[PDB]
């Protein structure tokens, strides 16, 4: 049977199922409704930065169609919707003046979701730093971001928190550090060789530290000022792709573990244990900032749940640990990526080159967090795969590969849960085909097809798969 034994009965009672989007990727109205530009608006509008010179000006136009999209998610039997608030839609300059039309939009969305029995899970930040804050303060390089983010978060708690009870601060600060400041391929396009300037060996760590400090400050504000009345929760969303030792050799096993530590431990060790991973301290040394005891105590325990974005897996090959001139966060790991073992690829690829379809990676990741971090409450906040550009509507709708993807990954998640992992929910990236950053509209992650000429929505087979699986 195409559900493969999966249904709500196959998951814990009250387990949450949802879909996910992000503001810039679906809203549109990027320069309308009072919204100020984000760093992604400037980036996307620069010729050559995005596939086809595309941008999120219109995107899926969810801004005008949100009731259609909410009706669709309810008809597909989902319990929840993870979306983000655009910082520059509320504060066009990131600070000071409030854009009331922006506030009204999120009020309207949140109220309609609740009207339809859909639980809002709200991200405050998804790659979309107000451009004004980048220019005035230097964005995530400036420790002042803690105050600036806290003030923004405070406004959101005050304005929406009587209705919103499930918050996330950030989405994937590792990717911001990696792509924005190590490789320099996402805004602000910083790296050692980059035209904008930078230092791939230092800036990724500065940025990560400031994300953690800003997270902790925003949560401290929530807990001291809003929690008593509002009785909600605040977490953070982290990407974690699985790393598997190429062989059982001491050095390959060490390499896979180093990769885990530099990937997820970088944030989870501070959040759970109040310090950076030991290996990062040992290898990165004085390029890794130190939490004072007070900061570490503010950071530790500051996530009510951990959002995990899980997509793929890689084999890791080791080497003798070397004394090396620092060059980048990426080279700091001292590992070698490998995508085949015993003559077989780890998995076939989806449309995105980085996305190897490896369902057991999901078990790997969830089991690892359970065993290593005292089984914290985890929410899978994104999981999915993409189709390529240029297909016919019908070809998009017959997404049999995506159906197989969800059945397999969810079976592996069920396996980890049945072994005792504290996973509270699962969210499919994405409800809709949308703006896939550098790939623009050439990558289609949705369970619902979006015709980007007419903006019409059409559920794909995977959407119907979810509807069947999730019926009450
Ligand atoms: O790459 C697919 C998807 O991966 C993660 F979920 C990111 O948070 C999204 O912004 C992105 O679109
Ligand atoms: Zn419109």
Curated annotation (Swiss-Prot):
The main place the protein resides is: secreted
Q: Per the UniProt entry, what is one GO biological process?
A: carbohydrate metabolic process
Q: What residues form the catalytic site here?
A: 172 (proton donor), 382 (nucleophile)
List UniProt keywords, sorted A-Z.
Disulfide bond, Glycoprotein, Glycosidase, Hydrolase, Secreted, Signal
Outcome when changing residue 186 to H: Decreases KM for substrate about 2-fold
Cysteine pairs bridged by disulfides in the record: 191-194
Superkingdom, taxonomy of origin: Eukaryota
- Give residues annotated as binding a beta-D-glucoside: 25, 126, 171-172, 311, 382, 429, 436-437, 445
Identify the EC number(s): 3.2.1.21
Reaction it catalyzes: Hydrolysis of terminal, non-reducing beta-D-glucosyl residues with release of beta-D-glucose
Task: Tell me which GO cellular component terms the UniProt record holds.
Answer: extracellular region
Glycosylation annotated at which residues? 248, 390
Where is the protein found, in the record's own terms?
Answer: Secreted
- Give the GO molecular function terms: amygdalin beta-glucosidase activity; beta-D-fucosidase activity; beta-galactosidase activity; beta-gentiobiose beta-glucosidase activity; beta-glucosidase activity; beta-L-arabinosidase activity; beta-mannosidase activity; cellobiose glucosidase activity
Task: Tell me its family.
Answer: Belongs to the glycosyl hydrolase 1 family.
Extract the PANTHER family matched here.
BETA-GLUCOSIDASE 7 (PTHR10353:SF77), GLYCOSYL HYDROLASE (PTHR10353)
Subunit and interaction comment: Homodimer.
Q: Summarize the protein's role.
A: Hydrolyzes p-nitrophenyl beta-D-glucoside, p-nitrophenyl beta-D-mannoside, p-nitrophenyl beta-D-galactoside, p-nitrophenyl beta-D-xyloside, p-nitrophenyl beta-D-fucoside, p-nitrophenyl beta-L-arabinoside, oligosaccharides, pyridoxine beta-D-glucoside and the cyanogenic glucosides amygdalin, prunasin and dhurrin. Possesses pyridoxine transglucosylation activity.
Protein name listed in UniProt: Beta-glucosidase 7
């Amino acid at each position: 049977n195409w559900l493969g034994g999966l249904s709500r009965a196959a998951f814990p009672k009250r387990f949450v199922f949802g879909t996910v989007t992000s503001a810039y990727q679906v809203e549109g109205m990027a320069a309308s409704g009072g919204r100020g530009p984000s760093i992604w608006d400037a980036f996307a509008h620069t010729p050559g930065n995005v596939a086809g010179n595309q941008n999120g000006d219109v995107a899926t136009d969810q801004y005008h169609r949100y009731k259609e999209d909410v009706n669709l998610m309810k008809s597909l039997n989902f319990d929840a919707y993870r979306f983000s608030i655009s910082w520059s839609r509320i504060f066009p300059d990131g600070e000071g003046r409030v854009n009331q039309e922006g506030v009204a939009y999120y009020n309207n969305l949140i109220n309609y979701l609740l009207q339809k029995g859909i639980t809002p899970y709200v991200n405050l930040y998804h790659y979309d730093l107000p451009l004004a804050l980048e220019k005035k303060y230097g964005g995530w390089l400036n420790a002042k971001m803690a105050d600036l983010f806290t003030e923004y978060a405070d406004f959101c708690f005050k304005t929406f928190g009587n209705r919103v009870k499930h918050w996330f601060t950030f989405n994937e600060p590792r990717i911001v550090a990696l792509l924005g400041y190590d490789q320099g391929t996402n805004p602000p396009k910083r790296c050692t060789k980059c035209a904008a300037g930078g230092n791939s060996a230092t800036e990724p760590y500065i940025v990560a530290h400031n994300f953690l400090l800003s997270h902790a400050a925003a949560v401290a504000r929530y807990r001291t000022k809003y929690q008593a009345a509002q009785q909600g929760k605040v977490g953070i969303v982290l990407d974690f792709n699985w790393y598997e030792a190429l062989s059982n050799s001491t050095e390959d096993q060490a390499a896979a573990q180093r990769a885990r530590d530099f990937h997820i431990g970088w944030y989870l060790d501070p959040l759970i244990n109040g310090h950076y991973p030991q290996i990062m301290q040992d290898l990165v040394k004085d390029r890794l900032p130190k939490f004072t005891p007070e900061q570490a105590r503010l950071v530790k325990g500051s996530a009510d749940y951990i959002g995990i974005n899980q997509y793929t897996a890689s084999y890791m090959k080791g080497q003798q640990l070397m004394q090396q001139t620092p060059t980048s966060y990426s080279a700091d790991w001292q590992v070698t990526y490998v995508f085949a073992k015993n003559g077989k690829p780890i998995g076939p690829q989806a449309n995105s080159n980085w996305l190897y379809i490896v369902p057991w990676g999901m078990y790997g990741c969830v089991n690892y967090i359970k065993q290593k971090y005292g089984n914290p409450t985890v929410v899978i906040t994104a999981n999915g795969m993409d189709q390529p550009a240029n297909l016919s509507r019908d070809q998009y709708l017959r997404d049999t590969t995506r159906v197989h993807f969800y059945r397999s990954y969810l079976t592996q998640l069920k396996k980890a849960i049945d072994e005792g992992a504290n996973v509270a929910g699962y969210f499919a990236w994405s409800l809709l085909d949308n703006f896939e950053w550098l790939s623009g509209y050439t990558s289609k992650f949705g369970i619902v097809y979006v015709d980007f000429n007419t903006l019409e929505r059409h559920p794909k087979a995977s959407a119907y798969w979810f509807r069947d699986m999730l019926k009450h």
